[PDB]
Amino acid sequence: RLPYDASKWEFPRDRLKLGKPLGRGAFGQVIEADAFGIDKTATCRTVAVKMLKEGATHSEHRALMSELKILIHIGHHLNVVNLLGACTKPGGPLMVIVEFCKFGNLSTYLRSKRNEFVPYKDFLTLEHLICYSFQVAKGMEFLASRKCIHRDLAARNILLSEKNVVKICDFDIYKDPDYVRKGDARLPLKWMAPETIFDRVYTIQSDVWSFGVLLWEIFSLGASPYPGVKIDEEFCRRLKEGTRMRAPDYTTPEMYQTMLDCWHGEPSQRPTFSELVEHLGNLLQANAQQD
Numbered sequence: 001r002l003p004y005d006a007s008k009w010e011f012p013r014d015r016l017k018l019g020k021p022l023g024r025g026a027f028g029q030v031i032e033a034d035a036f037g038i039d040k041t042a043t044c045r046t047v048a049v050k051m052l053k054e055g056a057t058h059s060e061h062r063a064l065m066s067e068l069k070i071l072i073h074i075g076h077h078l079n080v081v082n083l084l085g086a087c088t089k090p091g092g093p094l095m096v097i098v099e100f101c102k103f104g105n106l107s108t109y110l111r112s113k114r115n116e117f118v119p120y121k122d123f124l125t126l127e128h129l130i131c132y133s134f135q136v137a138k139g140m141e142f143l144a145s146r147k148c149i150h151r152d153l154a155a156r157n158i159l160l161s162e163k164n165v166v167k168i169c170d171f172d173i174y175k176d177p178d179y180v181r182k183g184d185a186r187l188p189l190k191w192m193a194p195e196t197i198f199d200r201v202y203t204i205q206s207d208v209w210s211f212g213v214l215l216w217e218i219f220s221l222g223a224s225p226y227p228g229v230k231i232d233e234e235f236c237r238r239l240k241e242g243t244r245m246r247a248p249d250y251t252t253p254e255m256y257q258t259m260l261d262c263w264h265g266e267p268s269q270r271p272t273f274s275e276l277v278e279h280l281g282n283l284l285q286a287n288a289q290q291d
């Protein structure tokens with residue numbers, strides 16, 4: 001759609017060697033791959049490649065090329081999943097090469113660390129959890145500055161790479177039910193602000209609500225929000241009137257206070273991601289203080 005600077009972005013297909021799919025979805029697939037020299041050094045880096053499936057409608061091609069263009073628009077930040085390059089020229093498939101985050105989505109990761117957590121000292125600790133939280137806030141402050149709205153901020157959509165760096169991704173009902181297991185899905189409604197459940201309107205301050213739900217997910221070590229409750233039209237009703245989740249098993253009091261601040265029923269009275277970054281950095285620095 002928008003102009004495309006091939007000098008900056010085009011990567012040669014003959015320096016890309018595809019491996020196995022990391023995941024396959026309704027509209028495309030993400031393949032694990034090796035790229036030679038994509039960061040301008042003389043190195044092989046494992047990257048992830050968004051590309052189409054073998055079916056592939058012109059609407060599915062147009063969408064990937066739109067995502068590529070939007071990624072170029074957003075630009076780089078440590079705490080988003082970054083565009084590394086693309087292959088768009090005649091001679092092969094459309095491929096959008098992005099950062100590989102080896103540990104996978106954060107929800108699944110945290111659930112896997114439940115017998116490997118200690119509040120403070122290999123293991124996860126409060127330091128890790130407030131870190132992940134600050135990093136997602138830093139990531140979202142950046143996206144707000146690019147005038148983006150995420151619309152589906154959840155711990156499933158946060159990826160973990162090396163050195164406890166965590167990165168926001170914008171992507172089940174899809175996957176083959178013969179192969180579907182217990183947490184292989186998530187009900188997005190549980191992350192939606194009252195004004196979005198109800199009026200279907202997305203803003204950056206509705207993303208601040210979902211960030212609160214994400215915080216809850218981090219500090220439950222990857223449990224599902226609203227435990228027990230069935231999500232009917234009275235869930236909604238109660239939600240719009242003031243009902244909120246209880247503190248999860250691994251929260252500190254300050255972090256639970258922050259969830260509740262992010263769940264202000266009134267969008268303008270929720271913290272901004274700039275205010276969350278400042279407050280969460282304070283909490284992070286306090287946590288590792290000494291005597």
Ligand SMILES: COC(=O)c1ccc2c(c1)NC(=O)/C2=C(\Nc1ccc(N(C)C(=O)CN2CCN(C)CC2)cc1)c1ccccc1
Pocket residue numbers: 022023024030032048050081098099100101102103104105159169170171
């Ligand atoms: C805009 O950018 C994007 O949109 C985007 C989207 C997805 C990913 C991405 C960028 N970048 C990644 O890394 C992604 C995934 N990554 C992944 C990583 C590790 C795993 N895990 C834990 C494995 O075990 C995989 N394992 C395979 C074998 N080799 C040897 C090692 C890695 C699984 C998925 C992933 C993709 C599909 C769905 C879930 C996540």
